[PDB]
Design a protein around this motif. Structure first.
Motif, PDB file in Angstrom:
ATOM      1  N   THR A  83       1.685   2.005  -7.760  1.00 47.36           N
ATOM      2  CA  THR A  83       1.519   0.946  -8.666  1.00 47.36           C
ATOM      3  C   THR A  83       2.060   1.523  -9.932  1.00 47.36           C
ATOM      4  OG1 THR A  83      -0.385   0.342  -7.230  1.00 47.36           O
ATOM      5  CG2 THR A  83       0.082  -0.878  -9.584  1.00 47.36           C
ATOM      6  N   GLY A  84       3.318   1.085 -10.297  1.00 43.01           N
ATOM      7  CA  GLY A  84       3.888   1.601 -11.412  1.00 43.01           C
ATOM      8  C   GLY A  84       5.404   0.797 -12.165  1.00 43.01           C
ATOM      9  N   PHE A  85       5.568   1.006 -13.232  1.00 41.04           N
ATOM     10  CA  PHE A  85       6.876   0.206 -13.717  1.00 41.04           C
ATOM     11  C   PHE A  85       7.816   1.489 -14.215  1.00 41.04           C
ATOM     12  CE2 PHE A  85       5.044  -3.885 -14.097  1.00 41.04           C
ATOM     13  CZ  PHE A  85       3.696  -3.731 -13.897  1.00 41.04           C
ATOM     14  N   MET A 141      -3.607   6.434 -16.641  1.00 35.14           N
ATOM     15  CA  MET A 141      -2.391   5.959 -16.564  1.00 35.14           C
ATOM     16  C   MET A 141      -1.306   6.799 -17.029  1.00 35.14           C
ATOM     17  SD  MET A 141      -1.094   2.419 -18.351  1.00 35.14           S
ATOM     18  CE  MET A 141      -2.668   1.677 -18.142  1.00 35.14           C
ATOM     19  N   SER A 175      14.175   5.959 -21.705  1.00 38.41           N
ATOM     20  CA  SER A 175      13.442   5.664 -20.037  1.00 38.41           C
ATOM     21  C   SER A 175      12.660   6.507 -19.804  1.00 38.41           C
ATOM     22  CB  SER A 175      14.668   5.347 -19.222  1.00 38.41           C
ATOM     23  OG  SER A 175      15.626   6.417 -19.302  1.00 38.41           O
ATOM     24  N   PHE A 176      11.595   5.894 -19.079  1.00 38.37           N
ATOM     25  CA  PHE A 176      10.494   6.679 -18.612  1.00 38.37           C
ATOM     26  C   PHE A 176       9.642   5.806 -17.621  1.00 38.37           C
ATOM     27  CE2 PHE A 176       9.062   3.683 -21.869  1.00 38.37           C
ATOM     28  CZ  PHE A 176       7.865   3.181 -21.287  1.00 38.37           C
ATOM     29  N   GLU A 177       8.706   6.371 -16.943  1.00 35.61           N
ATOM     30  CA  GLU A 177       8.023   5.772 -15.882  1.00 35.61           C
ATOM     31  C   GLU A 177       6.512   5.791 -16.205  1.00 35.61           C
ATOM     32  OE1 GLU A 177       9.122   7.060 -12.205  1.00 35.61           O
ATOM     33  OE2 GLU A 177       7.959   5.755 -10.965  1.00 35.61           O
ATOM     34  N   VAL A 178       5.725   4.926 -15.717  1.00 36.83           N
ATOM     35  CA  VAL A 178       4.172   4.844 -15.683  1.00 36.83           C
ATOM     36  C   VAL A 178       3.850   4.473 -14.554  1.00 36.83           C
ATOM     37  CG1 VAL A 178       4.739   2.853 -16.832  1.00 36.83           C
ATOM     38  CG2 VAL A 178       2.613   3.492 -16.769  1.00 36.83           C
ATOM     39  N   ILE A 179       2.809   5.411 -14.013  1.00 37.99           N
ATOM     40  CA  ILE A 179       2.268   5.279 -12.582  1.00 37.99           C
ATOM     41  C   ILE A 179       0.802   4.640 -12.922  1.00 37.99           C
ATOM     42  CG2 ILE A 179       1.732   6.065 -10.373  1.00 37.99           C
ATOM     43  CD1 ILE A 179       4.089   7.983 -10.925  1.00 37.99           C
ATOM     44  N   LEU A 180       0.482   3.426 -12.713  1.00 42.59           N
ATOM     45  CA  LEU A 180      -0.926   2.879 -12.895  1.00 42.59           C
ATOM     46  C   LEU A 180      -1.915   3.719 -11.862  1.00 42.59           C
ATOM     47  CD1 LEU A 180      -0.824  -0.682 -13.791  1.00 42.59           C
ATOM     48  CD2 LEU A 180      -0.292   1.720 -15.291  1.00 42.59           C
ATOM     49  N   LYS A 181      -1.547   3.865 -10.532  1.00 43.65           N
ATOM     50  CA  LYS A 181      -2.255   4.193  -9.203  1.00 43.65           C
ATOM     51  C   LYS A 181      -1.116   4.718  -8.207  1.00 43.65           C
ATOM     52  CE  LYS A 181      -4.011   0.638  -7.766  1.00 43.65           C
ATOM     53  NZ  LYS A 181      -4.193  -0.647  -7.277  1.00 43.65           N
ATOM     54  N   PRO A 182      -1.478   5.892  -7.517  1.00 45.40           N
ATOM     55  CA  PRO A 182      -0.352   6.099  -6.534  1.00 45.40           C
ATOM     56  C   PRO A 182      -0.674   5.490  -5.314  1.00 45.40           C
ATOM     57  CG  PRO A 182      -2.389   7.543  -6.628  1.00 45.40           C
ATOM     58  CD  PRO A 182      -2.605   6.796  -7.699  1.00 45.40           C
ATOM     59  N   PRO A 183       0.287   5.606  -4.178  1.00 50.56           N
ATOM     60  CA  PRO A 183       0.354   4.914  -2.978  1.00 50.56           C
ATOM     61  C   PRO A 183      -1.234   5.395  -2.224  1.00 50.56           C
ATOM     62  CG  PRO A 183       2.411   6.322  -3.156  1.00 50.56           C
ATOM     63  CD  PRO A 183       1.579   6.728  -4.374  1.00 50.56           C
ATOM     64  N   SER A 184      -1.156   4.672  -0.840  1.00 55.80           N
ATOM     65  CA  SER A 184      -2.143   4.648  -0.070  1.00 55.80           C
ATOM     66  C   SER A 184      -1.901   4.801   1.185  1.00 55.80           C
ATOM     67  CB  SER A 184      -2.980   3.382  -0.445  1.00 55.80           C
ATOM     68  OG  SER A 184      -3.329   2.978  -1.637  1.00 55.80           O
ATOM     69  N   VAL A 203       2.222   8.785 -17.621  1.00 52.90           N
ATOM     70  CA  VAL A 203       3.553   8.628 -18.306  1.00 52.90           C
ATOM     71  C   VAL A 203       4.387   9.880 -17.763  1.00 52.90           C
ATOM     72  CG1 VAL A 203       5.292   8.477 -20.251  1.00 52.90           C
ATOM     73  CG2 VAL A 203       2.996   7.146 -20.274  1.00 52.90           C
ATOM     74  N   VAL A 229      10.766   2.111 -16.555  1.00 55.12           N
ATOM     75  CA  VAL A 229      11.105   1.456 -17.986  1.00 55.12           C
ATOM     76  C   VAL A 229      12.117   1.857 -18.508  1.00 55.12           C
ATOM     77  CG1 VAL A 229      10.224   0.971 -20.570  1.00 55.12           C
ATOM     78  CG2 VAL A 229       8.476   0.920 -18.251  1.00 55.12           C
ATOM     79  N   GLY A 230      13.232   0.874 -19.148  1.00 56.60           N
ATOM     80  CA  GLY A 230      14.438   1.347 -19.711  1.00 56.60           C
ATOM     81  C   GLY A 230      14.549   0.721 -21.010  1.00 56.60           C
ATOM     82  N   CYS A 264       3.518   1.945  -1.710  1.00 60.11           N
ATOM     83  CA  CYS A 264       4.537   2.127  -3.034  1.00 60.11           C
ATOM     84  C   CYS A 264       3.261   2.429  -4.108  1.00 60.11           C
ATOM     85  CB  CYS A 264       5.238   1.142  -3.273  1.00 60.11           C
ATOM     86  SG  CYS A 264       6.553   0.535  -2.113  1.00 60.11           S
ATOM     87  N   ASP A 302       0.935  -1.262  -0.057  1.00 56.71           N
ATOM     88  CA  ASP A 302       0.264   0.050  -0.004  1.00 56.71           C
ATOM     89  C   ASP A 302       0.800   1.178  -0.208  1.00 56.71           C
ATOM     90  OD1 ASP A 302      -2.539  -0.988  -0.082  1.00 56.71           O
ATOM     91  OD2 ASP A 302      -2.845  -1.468   1.968  1.00 56.71           O
TER      92      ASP A 302
END
Ligand SMILES: Nc1nc2c(ncn2[C@@H]2O[C@H](COP(=O)(O)OP(=O)(O)OP(=O)(O)O)[C@@H](O)[C@H]2O)c(=O)[nH]1
Ligand SMILES: Nc1ncnc2c1ncn2[C@@H]1O[C@H](COP(=O)(O)OP(=O)(O)CP(=O)(O)O)[C@@H](O)[C@H]1O
Ligand SMILES: Nc1nc2c(ncn2[C@@H]2O[C@H](COP(=O)(O)OP(=O)(O)O)[C@@H](O)[C@H]2O)c(=O)[nH]1
Ligand SMILES: COc1ccc(N(C)c2nc(Cl)nc3sccc23)cc1
Ligand SMILES: [Ca+2]
Ligand SMILES: [Mg+2]
Ligand SMILES: [Mg+2]
Lengths: 437, 427, 53, 268
Positions: free
Chosen positions: A349-351, C1, C14-23, C3, A353-354, A347, A345
């Motif tokens: 929810t993400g990735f 979603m 390179s880059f980042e993708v956050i589907l949903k933030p913390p809680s 980027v 990427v490289g 952290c 909870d």
């Protein structure tokens, strides 16, 4: 540019180190003599590959590596092998009596006699570094040298290089290819003593590598050479950000930052795709979506375990080849709907990427097919604690009867170091459990 | 990593000589020390047992010992008898009269220092000595009494090297004298304390194999020693040849011996063959596996179903599928899991070497640390007390200065060894 | 979603993708490495003394 | 010969399954802690899934689905139904965080619930055992409410009406069948629950494989309309049906991995 020194300990670590350095030379266009026609800065440079290679005035590119074993058999093959001219003789350090599969013999009796020599040969490479980042340490859990000498070395590195990152590539023991009945003892002993001195550790279970070679490479009974070529492709995926231009995992500190939010839980799981036999004449090339989806299939993980029943604290995707960000995000969106990917909870929810546009390099004549795109996923999931559960159980069966302890006590170790190491592992399994339910 | 080989007394020297005949042929050394071999697997680790000399002559690292000149003469007259370094023949003149006390306390003491001088010369020229390997019988006087005296002194001067023995146990079916149970019991007491590993080569098992399986109606020591040399060649394969498991005496000890005193191994071999008659159908890997675990292939005359395997080491020799070897070895353990202690995970380990022994396209050698070995020691204990309760034949020993008390300690230590093996049969 | 953090170069991006933030010290290491050698030397002294008996 | 170990000695169902396995002469029971088993009839809690499928030379199978507890614990089920889009926030689960007009058998004005045994095999086939059972209550009154067998503690033997009599009742009283009025709804409910969690618990590409027996508890209302009450992950059978069901568990779930039908396959 900051340099990285690679340290290879024992039979597994050396033979895996040879596979990696062979691959590194192919990817960077460095020939077995150490010459690099593409380096126009003769004698020096602060290019990315200089993180792993120093340059001589004569234009030779020399690995920032020391190979160490308590017996000469294996490193002697490096001394006479195709890449012999690559390494300075001082980097290949050999004893006469190995550890006999005995952690205590590697850490205490034989280890204490050679530690000072190794640390000085290491100091010799550090001294050619303008800013030393830290160390990549390759070794088995199961060998007497890989476990016992490595942990002695990791303690000293923390003393002599306090501010410097230490990363591990660790071969977890599997019965199909193991050499000793006491590998569970050495694994727990070396994990306990090393845990605090390591910032990040990539475990590779020989059972996983073995089945991948049987299932996907159609190798009926894989040898150490089969495993090490596949393992070196994965290590190359993990280290490519340190040797090539880019913005993701450019230094060793970023590995902790991006993959280890809590210090003791620092064993990211590696998953690799696609693994295709060189023998397949007709192969349909896999899309971004197919190889990315394959990162969530347990049969492609470096350790067999079930991430669906654990929680994620971090996740990175390392692509090599014909990959563009749009396809990745498209792939992720559909994978997210269809998969059990639960993050702790605290952290996001993400990735991270490289993408490296150079598609993976394959050893000419190896078992791996050339492919148009490949990916290595590094995820820190509590599911990897299943491997600790397996190992601690095996340890418990033998230790309850004290089977084989006299070989350790006979070398100067104390029985209480066994239970003390076991207790640490009990705390570790407990940590993963709190972070994962 | 050099091994030093010592062979003592009549039995020791006879099976010692056979061992060097057989492995020399396997490594392509002829009786004159010259290598005439095909493969280079034959010389990779050849220095483990052989010393280098001018003209690329290979000389066995072997010391021949006996209080009696006769058998060493016969060795010198034997086929490979000229390969041994002549200064490594160390012998007396009075023999030991099948008397452990003469070998250990009176006649053997006179000669033991000369032997230790030869051992020292060989050791002082090794890069890293692994340890020693002794062939001897336990039922005579020299190999048994002087052999164990040598072990005790070698340990004092080399306390950090491995001591390994091939010990021929006496049987009333192949018996020189009635006092063999006495000599054997005194020796077992020494071996328990001062070797790291001993292969129990039981003359009862070798006799039964020649008689029942090989159909030899009147077995000789020659027929017994054919079995012993096939076993000795098999069990050392991973010490002499390069493979995925490059073994040495310490790695064998570490992985086979869970508790210091339980270091007595049952060797096994398949296919079982008699001298001279070769059969022409090679075995299938499933046949090797089943015969090698069969009680009729054990050289220690103990039923393995009467105990549990603590650890097992197997080696398959010849050209064959390692996948089939792995599956077949995995099969035997999974189908018979009750006979392998559950508290030593994965206690069966298999090696494979491409070179087969002479005359076989395929062989399997078996090394078991089974709690059923206690049957061997009980058998000897019964024979000992049958005489000892009447103090029969003791004067041969009190005549050399020994006391009855010494016999009591040795018998009681052997009974302790039996109890300890019984402890783990049930856990 | 979402980027973020996109960095491009001629080798890749390179880059980042956050589907949903913390809680331990060097001397403590020296101590235990030598404690072990004394237990070894002690046990070997019991062996030789018993062999002297 | 296949080998199995027994780690829950209180399972009537798998006690009978052990009995059946031995009597084929093709299965030998190992000791609880021996790891060289083909089959684990495992313990009900803290079952060690992380130690399965790492035995070279052994195909391993276990009688539980890791993760199926989400369906099988009172508060997890409501969480799963409310949150999973496949089961919307859903016409057949009572609102959660009493069914005031149940169907009542006559004679007796009684109240009941239907238990259905469902077996999910390693291939994730869903098999509904054809024999159900109603649990009767020896007279329902607003202002004999909990149909539990023990609580009710005798019409029909042991307070159990099997499907033939219950179906005969629906034809006489209500002019309909057990198939049309209730079972379509039950097969629908079972299918939806198990299709929902299939991605979380399936063992199709896993190094070990699972099957598992479930007990679905249903409550029919006065409109012949079915509701899901509870899903039980370690159920017991009725004595009349033990023999058949346990024999079925062997044919469908165990012999299928290690080599007319009493189950209805719910196709998905
Ligand atoms: N993946 C892989 N694993 C290896 C390799 N070599 C050895 N191992 C593993 O390492 C374990 C034993 O540790 P080793 O590294 O071989 O022993 P060591 O480090 O040389 O230490 P010593 O006991 O002194 O020989 C075995 O269980 C093997 O599975 C290798 O080349 N590749
Ligand atoms: N919403 C509801 N409306 C009407 N009756 C209900 C109900 N919920 C439960 N009941 C009845 O009351 C009983 C309460 O028992 P509960 O459902 O807690 O037992 P259980 O199903 O856990 C026992 P077992 O595990 O042995 O099957 C149910 O068995 C059912 O007969
Ligand atoms: N297998 C085998 N056993 C032997 C041989 N020679 C002697 N023995 C055994 O050894 C015992 C005799 O001891 P021996 O070695 O001859 O006395 P030593 O000369 O003092 O060593 C007898 O019980 C025999 O069974 C042999 O060539 N082969
Ligand atoms: C119980 O697990 C074991 C048993 C033995 C060994 N080792 C060291 C061996 N050493 C030699 Cl000399 N030959 C052989 S043949 C098969 C193993 C083997 C390793 C693990
Ligand atoms: Ca440059
Ligand atoms: Mg080594
Ligand atoms: Mg004689």
């Amino acid at each position: 540019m900051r340099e990285c020194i690679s340290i290879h300990v024992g039979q597994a670590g050396v033979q895996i180190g040879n596979a990696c350095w062979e691959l590194y030379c192919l990817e960077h266009g460095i020939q077995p003599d150490g010459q690099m026609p593409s380096d126009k800065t003769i004698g020096g440079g602060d290019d990315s590959f200089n993180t792993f290679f120093s340059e001589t005035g004569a234009g030779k590119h020399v690995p920032r590596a020391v190979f160490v074993d308590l017996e000469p058999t294996v490193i002697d093959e490096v001394r006479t092998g195709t890449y012999r001219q690559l390494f300075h003789p001082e980097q290949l350090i050999t004893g006469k009596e190995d550890a006999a599969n005995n952690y205590a013999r590697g850490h205490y009796t034989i280890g204490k006699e050679i530690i000072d020599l190794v640390l000085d040969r290491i100091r010799k490479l550090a001294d050619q570094c303008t800013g030393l980042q830290g160390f990549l340490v390759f070794h088995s859990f199961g060998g007497g040298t890989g476990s016992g000498f490595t942990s002695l070395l990791m303690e000293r590195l923390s003393v002599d290089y306090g501010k410097k990152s230490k990363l591990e590539f660790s071969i977890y023991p599997a019965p199909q290819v193991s050499t000793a009945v006491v590998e569970p003892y050495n694994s727990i002993l070396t994990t306990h003593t090393t845990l605090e001195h390591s910032d990040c550790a990539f475990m590779v279970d020989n059972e996983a590598i073995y089945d991948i070679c049987r299932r996907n490479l159609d190798i009926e009974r894989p040898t150490y050479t089969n495993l090490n070529r596949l393992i070196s492709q994965i290590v190359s995926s993990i280290t490519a950000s340190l040797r090539f231009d880019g913005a993701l995992n450019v230094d060793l500190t970023e590995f902790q930052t991006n993959l280890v939010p809590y210090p003791r839980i620092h064993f990211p799981l590696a998953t690799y795709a696609p693994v295709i036999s060189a023998e397949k004449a007709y192969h349909e090339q896999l899309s971004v979506a197919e190889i990315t989806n394959a990162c969530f299939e347990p049969a492609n993980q470096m350790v067999k375990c079930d991430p669906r029943h654990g929680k994620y604290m971090a996740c990175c995707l390392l692509y090599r080849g014909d990959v563009v960000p749009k396809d990745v995000n498209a792939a992720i969106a559909t994978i997210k709907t269809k998969r059990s990917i639960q993050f702790v909870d605290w952290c996001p929810t993400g990735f991270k990427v490289g993408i490296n546009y150079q598609p993976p390099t394959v050893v000419p004549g190896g078992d791996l097919a050339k492919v148009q795109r490949a990916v290595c996923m590094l995820s820190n999931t509590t599911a990897i604690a299943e491997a600790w559960a397996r190992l601690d159980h095996k340890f418990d069966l033998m230790y309850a009867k004290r089977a084989f302890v006299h070989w350790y006590v006979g070398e100067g170790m104390e029985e209480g170091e066994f239970s003390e190491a076991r207790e640490d592992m009990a705390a570790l399994e407990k940590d993963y459990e709190e972070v994962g339910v | 990593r050099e091994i030093v080989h010592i062979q003592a007394g009549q039995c020791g020297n006879q099976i010692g000589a056979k061992f060097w005949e057989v492995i020399s042929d396997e490594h392509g050394i002829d009786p004159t020390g010259s290598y005439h071999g095909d493969s280079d697997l034959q010389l990779e680790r050849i220095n483990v047992y052989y010393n280098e000399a001018t003209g690329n002559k290979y000389v066995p690292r072997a010391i021949l010992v006996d209080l009696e000149p006769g058998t060493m003469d016969s060795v010198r007259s034997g086929p490979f008898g000229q390969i041994f370094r002549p200064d490594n023949f160390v012998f007396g003149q009075s023999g030991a009269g099948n008397n452990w006390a003469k070998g250990h306390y009176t006649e053997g003491a006179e000669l033991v220092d000369s032997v230790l001088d030869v051992v020292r010369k060989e050791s002082e020229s090794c890069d890293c000595l692994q340890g020693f390997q002794l062939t001897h019988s336990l039922g005579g006087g020299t190999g048994s009494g002087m052999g164990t005296l040598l072990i005790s002194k070698i340990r004092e001067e080399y306390p950090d090297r491995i001591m390994n023995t091939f010990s021929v146990m006496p049987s009333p079916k192949v018996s020189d004298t009635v006092v063999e149970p006495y000599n054997a019991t005194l020796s077992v007491h020494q071996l328990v304390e001062n070797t790291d590993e001993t292969y129990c080569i039981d003359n009862e098992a070798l006799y039964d194999i020649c008689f029942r399986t090989l159909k030899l109606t009147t077995p000789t020591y020659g027929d017994l020693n054919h079995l012993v040399s096939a076993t000795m060649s098999g069990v050392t394969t991973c010490l002499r040849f390069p493979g995925q498991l490059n073994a040495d005496l310490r790695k064998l000890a570490v992985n086979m011996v869970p508790f210091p005193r339980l270091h007595f191994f049952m060797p096994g071999f398949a296919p079982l063959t008699s001298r001279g008659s070769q059969q022409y159908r090679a075995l299938t890997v499933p046949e090797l596996t089943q015969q090698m675990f069969d009680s009729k292939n054990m050289m220690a005359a103990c039923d393995p179903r009467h105990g549990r395997y603590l650890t097992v080491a197997a080696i398959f020799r010849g050209r064959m599928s390692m996948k089939e070897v792995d599956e077949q070895m995995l099969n035997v353990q999974n189908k018979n899991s009750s006979y392998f202690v559950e508290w030593i995970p994965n206690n069966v380990k298999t090696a494979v070497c491409d070179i087969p022994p002479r005359g076989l396209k395929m062989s399997a050698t078996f090394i078991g640390n089974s709690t059923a070995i206690q049957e061997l020691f009980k058998r000897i204990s019964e024979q000992f007390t049958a005489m000892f309760r009447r103090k029969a034949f003791l004067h041969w020993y009190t005549g050399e200065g020994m006391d009855e008390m010494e016999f009591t300690e040795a018998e009681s230590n052997m009974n302790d060894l039996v109890s300890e093996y019984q402890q783990y049969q049930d856990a | 979603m979402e980027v973020i953090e996109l960095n491009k170069c001629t080798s890749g991006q390179s880059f980042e993708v956050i589907l949903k933030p913390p809680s331990p010290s060097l001397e403590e290491i020296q101590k235990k490495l030598e404690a072990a050698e004394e237990r070894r030397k002690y046990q070997e002294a019991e062996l030789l003394k018993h062999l002297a008996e | 010969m296949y080998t199995f170990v027994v780690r829950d000695e209180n399972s009537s169902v798998y006690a009978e399954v052990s009995r059946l396995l031995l009597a084929t002469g093709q299965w030998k029971r190992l000791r609880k802690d021996n790891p060289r088993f083909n089959l684990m009839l495992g313990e009900r809690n803290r079952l060690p899934f992380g130690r399965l499928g790492h035995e070279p030379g052994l195909v391993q199978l276990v009688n539980y689905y890791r993760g199926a507890d989400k369906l099988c614990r009172k508060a997890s089920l409501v969480k799963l139904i409310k949150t999973s889009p496949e089961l919307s926030e859903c016409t057949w689960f009572p609102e959660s965080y009493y069914l005031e007009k149940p169907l009542l058998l006559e004679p007796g004005h009684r109240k009941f619930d239907i238990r259905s045994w469902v077996l999910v095999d390693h291939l994730y086939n869903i098999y509904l055992y054809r024999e159900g059972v109603l649990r009767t209550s020896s007279p329902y009154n607003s202002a004999c409410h909990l149909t539990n067998h023990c609580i009710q503690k005798g019409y029909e033997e042991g307070n159990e009406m099997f499907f033939e009599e219950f179906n005969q009742y629906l034809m006489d009283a209500l002019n309909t069948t057990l198939e049309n009025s209730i079972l379509l709804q039950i097969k629908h409910i079972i299918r939806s629950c198990l299709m929902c969690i299939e991605p979380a618990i399936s063992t199709k590409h896993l190094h070990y494989q699972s099957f598992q027996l479930f007990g679905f508890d249903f409550m029919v209302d006065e409109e012949l309309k079915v509701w899901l009450i509870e899903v039980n992950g370690a159920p017991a059978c009725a004595q009349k049906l033990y023999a058949e069901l346990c024999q079925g568990i062997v044919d469908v779930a165990i012999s299928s991995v290690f080599p007319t039908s009493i189950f209805i396959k719910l196709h998905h």
